[PDB]
Design a binder for this molecule. Structure first.
Ligand SMILES: CC(=O)SCCNC(=O)CCNC(=O)[C@H](O)C(C)(C)COP(=O)(O)OP(=O)(O)OC[C@H]1O[C@@H](n2cnc3c(N)ncnc32)[C@H](O)[C@@H]1OP(=O)(O)O
Length: 376
């Protein structure tokens, strides 16, 4: 954290010179959650705790939202000296209501790099417990006469990035594909768009001994390998970061993320009682063969696993992030973006005006403004 420290610093460095933008950086209160990967009974170490935090970002220009990004950070604790973090990139989207040229690719990369700079201890200082104790008072006692957990871990811990590329008309902006200015990448372009972002993350932010993995489920590895040849990070391989013998059973290896085609298919296997039957190999085949084919669309899975070049030591300021007091408040603010109709620019205007009004009135806070620094 030497040149660029703030989320303001990071966004500004990739946004066009002298142009003005605003951002929403919204964050849930960290909470205890189920392990990312289902534990096996016959394993010698099960996580002490798994802590999950959502970062939701929205970028604005000229009083209109135009981009949003939803990311989940999981800190998995095995002991005091033994921990891992994983950044799951869940949904990125645009609505086409921006009248200036920006690189959404670079905005997306730079956001993840801000996130990579956060000390995992930031999420561990105040954590909502998975099980809360309550004493409930029966109304019978009224007459006519009347806790957060905390943890620590090392700053420099094993860092994972996971994402599933799959194009759609929209993920965060309903009916935005009705906007003729919205630019939708096809599956192949989108896989390349994310592979470019990850390649730069590896080169700018990770040590040279880092695992970098790409698979295209149900497809022969010969296609994957050819593409990887153009990467600048020297250690990309075909496959994933889940591999190895927790047994070959998919359920004890596949991570389970919100709204992810994985989890969705593990859940179908659960309903079919086949969790103790399907190997990782059959998994990737049936994922495509039985579930993902209906989308008629090129999809890929990408994983990174390794150590950051610089020790993450940022605790985001109130400028960097807004953490609502409440889960209801988090949800109401996010829904001003995600519950809007974007078939006209009026949806992009209304999202901005509702968000800024909510923040000002309920939380005495503004959207942050940015002046771009990148020349052409
Ligand atoms: C993990 C996941 O979330 S996967 C799901 C991803 N999200 C979606 O599929 C939802 C729909 N897609 C989108 O919203 C968009 O297509 C995104 C966010 C994926 C990318 O948005 P874009 O604005 O295309 O991104 P960006 O600014 O980086 O430009 C990408 C390329 O498209 C070009 N481009 C951008 N806008 C336009 C346009 N209106 N017309 C023509 N070309 C354009 C750029 O020149 C660039 O070209 P290059 O890659 O050859 O340099």
């Amino acid at each position: 954290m030497a040149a660029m420290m703030s989320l303001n610093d990071f966004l500004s460095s990739v946004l066009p010179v002298s142009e003005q933008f605003e951002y929403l950086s919204l964050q849930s209160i960290p909470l205890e959650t189920h392990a990312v990967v289902t534990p096996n009974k016959d394993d010698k170490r099960v996580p002490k705790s798994t802590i999950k935090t959502q970062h939701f970002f929205s970028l604005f220009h000229q009083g209109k939202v135009f981009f949003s990004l939803e990311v989940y950070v999981y800190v998995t604790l095995w002991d005091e000296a033994d921990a891992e973090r994983l950044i799951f990139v869940s949904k990125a989207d645009t609505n086409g209501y921006c009248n200036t040229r920006v690189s959404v690719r670079d905005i997306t990369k730079i956001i993840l790099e801000f996130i990579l700079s956060i000390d995992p201890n930031y999420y561990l200082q105040k954590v909502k417990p998975a099980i809360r104790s309550y004493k409930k008072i029966s109304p019978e006692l009224i007459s006519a006469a009347s806790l957060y957990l905390s943890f620590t871990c090392p700053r420099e811990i094993l860092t994972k990035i996971c994402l599933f590329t799959r194009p759609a008309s929209q993920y965060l902006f309903p009916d935005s594909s009705k906007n003729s200015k919205k630019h939708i990448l096809n599956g192949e372009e989108l896989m390349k768009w994310w592979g470019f972002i990850l390649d730069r993350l590896l080169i700018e932010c990770f040590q040279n001994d880092t695992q970098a993995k790409l698979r295209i489920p149900g497809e022969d590895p010969a296609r994957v390998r050819s593409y990887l040849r153009g990467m600048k990070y020297p250690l990309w391989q075909v496959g994933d970061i889940f591999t190895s013998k927790e047994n070959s059973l998919a359920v004890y290896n596949i991570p389970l993320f919100p709204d992810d085609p994985k989890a969705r298919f593990i859940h179908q296997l659960a309903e079919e009682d086949r969790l103790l039957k399907v190997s990782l190999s059959s998994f990737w085949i049936e994922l495509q063969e039985r579930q993902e084919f209906k989308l008629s669309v090129t999809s890929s899975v990408m994983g990174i696993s390794g150590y950051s070049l610089a020790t993450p030591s940022l605790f985001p300021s109130s400028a960097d992030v807004i953490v609502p007091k409440s889960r209801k408040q988090f949800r109401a603010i996010k829904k001003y973006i995600t519950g809007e109709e974007y078939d006209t620019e009026e949806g992009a205007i209304e999202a901005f005006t509702n968000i800024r009004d909510f923040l000002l009135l309920r939380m005495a806070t503004n959207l942050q403004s940015l002046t771009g620094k990148r020349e052409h």
